[PDB]
Amino acid sequence: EVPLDEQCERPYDASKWEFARERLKLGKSLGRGAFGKVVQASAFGIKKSPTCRTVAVKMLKEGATASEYKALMTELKILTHIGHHLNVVNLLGACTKQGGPLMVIVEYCKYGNLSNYLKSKRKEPITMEDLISYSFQVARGMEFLSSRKCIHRDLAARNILLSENNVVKICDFGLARDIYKNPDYVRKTRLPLKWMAPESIFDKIYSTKSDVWSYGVLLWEIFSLGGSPYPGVQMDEDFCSRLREGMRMRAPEYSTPEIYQIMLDCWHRDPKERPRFAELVEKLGDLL
Ligand SMILES: O=C(Nc1ccc(Cl)cc1)c1ccccc1NCc1ccncc1
Ligand SMILES: [Cl-]
């Protein structure tokens, strides 16, 4: 019944994750929010390995209050009781010394997000097999998250990061996403409207079945080679009523009838009747 994040106020295992702040050299920025940032760092000894590694580190900005501290502490807890999984950004350790700055350390994804990457081809030539691979990996990563009672709530290509070997990883910049600027978030709070299921928009209801909707838009994002959803549409009270009225996007340019079919399934009015992430993995498995 209880989503993972609200359930994560009821056990941190420093025994396992605590990592000395002296072992980090903090470096260039990767993302600034209002009260949070992510920076690149080099860690010596992460995971009990006396080697040297590049990691990404999320941490509070000045101006941040105890609220954001609690938020980042909830993110850490979540990342600790997850796994991890090839297609999710993996936790590597944390700094939590009382008195010291909170820092969440995860694996570094060298090639940025997937939207930008596909746009960079919209250095090798991209193929249909590639697009399907990425779609399948994200679906695999979401089947993992779902099965952990974890609702993402902002799934979209800007939140899929590209690692080595063509592996893609689900992340969330969270407090470190700049959202004042990004036109992907509209004042309603500012929300990723274009990626949200109708029931989330209207009743403020979120669930794995609403992540599936967003996964649908994500697929549109991928098979348009990093295009933005509902292109040429503005975002007002009217954009909704339509959306709640069977109104959907047309197939993107590099998609297949078969793959379009899949987005439409994800965009069913009734959430109870959108596919589970398990069937998405199988369908696409079948196309690989
Ligand atoms: O994505 C992050 N956390 C997150 C939160 C929720 C979920 Cl489902 C998956 C991951 C995150 C956690 C700590 C530090 C950086 C982070 N993300 C952005 C980053 C940028 C570069 N390479 C890896 C991640
Ligand atoms: Cl560690």
Q: Measure the CA–CA gap between 61 and 69, rounded to whole angstroms.
A: 10
Q: Measure the CA–CA gap between 268 and 273, rounded to whole angstroms.
A: 7
Facing residues of 207 across strands?
Answer: none
Angle CA(190)–CA(194)–CA(198) in degrees, nearest 5? 95
CA distances from 57 to 19, 92, 189 (A): 12, 10, 26
CA-wise closest residue to 172 among 82, 238, 253: 82
Active-site hit among 13, 154, 211, 270: 154
Domain with CATH 3.30.200.20 in the chain: 1-108
199 lines ligand 1 (CB under 6 A): no
Indicate the SS3 state at residue 70: helix
153 lines ligand 1 (CB under 6 A): no
CB contact at 8 A, 158 and 151: no
User: Atom 14 of ligand 1 has which residue's CA nearest to it?
Assistant: 58
CB contact at 8 A, 196 and 153: no
Place of tokens 């800007």: 158
Q: Compute the half-sphere exposure of residue 154: CA atoms within 13 Å on the CB side of its CA.
A: 14
Mutate to test the pocket of ligand 1, among 29, 57, 103, 106 (most ligand atoms within 8 A of CB): 106
220 lines ligand 1 (CB under 6 A): no
Domain with CATH 1.10.510.10 in the chain: 109-288
- How far does the centroid of ligand 1 lie from the alpha carbon of residue 232, in Å? 31
What is the 3-class SS of 202-245, one letter each residue? HHCCCCHHHHHHHHHHHHHHHHCCCCCCCCCCCCCHHHHHHHCC
Q: Measure the CA–CA gap between 105 and 165, rounded to whole angstroms.
A: 21
How many Cβ atoms sit within 10 Å of the Cβ of residue 85?
Answer: 17
Angle CA(220)–CA(286)–CA(266) in degrees, nearest 5? 35
Q: Measure the CA–CA gap between 61 and 68, rounded to whole angstroms.
A: 10
Which residues in 9-140 belong to E strands, given as ranges?
24-32, 36-44, 52-60, 91-95, 103-107
The yes/no answer on whether domain 1-108 falls in CATH 1.10.8.350 is: no
Place of tokens 């994560």: 8
| Six-digit token string for 248 | 């959907």
Q: Which residues contact 127 (CB under 8 A, 6 or more apart)?
A: none
CB contact at 8 A, 24 and 103: yes
Q: Which amino acid is at 140?
A: R
The H helix count followed by the E strand count for the chain is 10, 9
CB contact at 8 A, 120 and 71: no
Q: Measure the CA–CA gap between 175 and 37, rounded to whole angstroms.
A: 7
Angle CA(22)–CA(25)–CA(74) in degrees, nearest 5? 75
What is the 3-class SS of 147-213, one letter each residue? CCCCCCCCCCHHHEEECHHHCEEECCCHHHCCCCCCCCCEECCEECHHHCCHHHHHHCCCCHHHHHH
- How far does the centroid of ligand 1 lie from the alpha carbon of residue 173, in Å? 6
> How is the beta sheet containing 103-107 ordered, strand by strand?
24-32, 36-44, 52-60, 103-107, 91-95
Resolution to 1 decimal, in Å?
Answer: 2.7
Q: Which residues contact 168 (CB under 8 A, 6 or more apart)?
A: 87, 114, 134, 137, 138, 141, 160, 161, 162
Q: Compute the half-sphere exposure of residue 57: CA atoms within 13 Å on the CB side of its CA.
A: 28
Facing residues of 41 across strands?
Answer: 26, 55
Q: Is 154 a catalytic residue?
A: yes
Q: Measure the CA–CA gap between 35 and 217, rounded to whole angstroms.
A: 28
Q: Measure the CA–CA gap between 132 and 223, rounded to whole angstroms.
A: 9
Strands 190-191 and 91-95: unpaired
Angle CA(211)–CA(115)–CA(85) in degrees, nearest 5? 55
Write out the CATH class of domain 109-288.
mainly alpha
- How far does the centroid of ligand 1 lie from the alpha carbon of residue 106, in Å? 7
Give the ligand 1 atom nearest the CA of 58.
14
Strands 160-162 and 186-187: unpaired
State the ligand closest to the CA atom of 92.
Answer: 2
CA-wise closest residue to 215 among 274, 164, 129, 283: 274
R_g over Cα of the chain:
19
